[PDB]
Design a protein around this ligand. Structure first.
Ligand SMILES: C=C1/C(=C\C=C2/CCC[C@]3(C)[C@@H]([C@H](C)CCCC(C)(C)O)CC[C@@H]23)C[C@@H](O)C[C@@H]1O
Lengths: 7, 236
């Protein structure tokens, strides 16, 4: 999954 | 004895940042997993803290200069200070009359007993409540409250920080704003506020200690959120 990308 | 236009705009930016990221109605709390009273309060408080971490991220992004830092520096600052900013920002819901955090209704009123049902002991909750009392007695203006949060977040002495000089220069400018604000508005408070930052370090330590015992039990770590696991985790 696309998790620090909430920078 | 006068606040500069840039210093005034820094305060305006921070107050506006806090208003955009702190909802006094607490109407979003109904979307958390419900509180119930083996660690019955962990799901609700995990959602509460996870929700608050995302608010702290939005607040940090609106701090003047924070966006100019590298992505790695922004993440390192937030990871290390998130629990402290949450403890600071929670003073707005803390009440000396109740000695608890009141967030609109009895379902969302959190006392020490509630947090023990989330895996934490009095070794953390007692100093945390004593901290909330001492901070509440300072009667900080909203300007001082948000400046203290920005100063806490822009601390240069945090694990994983690369550009220590640039971050300290940003924090130093925030401290000069706070000192100039206090001199104008309060004809000792600054030393009291700086002391609270040292208190937050001790609370950060004890929470990290107790979070490790919590997160090392698979039955409990799986009740946390992805954001909580990443921010409070030891991953570098
Ligand atoms: C969130 C905020 C609020 C209360 C903060 C509290 C009350 C309950 C217990 C808390 C959440 C402490 C707990 C020790 C944190 C434990 C989290 C975990 C279980 C993952 O280890 C830290 C702050 C305390 C409400 C509102 O002020 C927003 C603020 O933003």
């Amino acid at each position: 999954e696309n998790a620090x990308x909430x920078x | 004895h006068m606040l500069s236009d840039e210093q005034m705009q820094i305060i305006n930016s921070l107050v506006e940042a806090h208003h955009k990221t702190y909802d006094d109605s607490y109407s979003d709390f109904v979307r958390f997993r419900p509180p119930v009273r083996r660690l019955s309060m962990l799901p609700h408080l995990a959602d509460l803290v996870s929700y608050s971490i995302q608010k702290v991220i939005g607040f940090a992004k609106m701090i003047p200069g924070f966006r100019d830092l590298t992505a790695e520096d922004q993440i390192a600052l937030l990871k290390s200070s998130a629990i402290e900013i949450i403890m600071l920002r929670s003073n707005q819901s803390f009440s000396l009359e109740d000695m608890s955090w009141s967030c609109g209704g009895p379902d969302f009123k959190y006392c020490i007993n509630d947090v023990t049902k989330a895996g934490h002991t009095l070794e953390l909750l007692e100093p945390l409540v004593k901290f909330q009392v001492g901070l509440k007695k300072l009667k900080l203006h909203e300007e001082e409250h948000v400046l203290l949060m920005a100063i806490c977040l822009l601390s240069p002495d945090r694990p994983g920080v690369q550009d220590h000089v640039r971050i300290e220069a940003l924090q130093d400018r925030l401290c000069d704003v706070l000192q100039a604000y206090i001199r104008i508005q309060h004809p000792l408070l600054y030393a009291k506020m700086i002391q609270k930052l040292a208190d937050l370090r001790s609370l950060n330590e004890e929470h990290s200690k107790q979070y490790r015992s919590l997160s090392f039990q698979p039955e409990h770590s799986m009740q946390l959120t992805p954001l909580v696991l990443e921010v409070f985790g030891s991953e570098v």
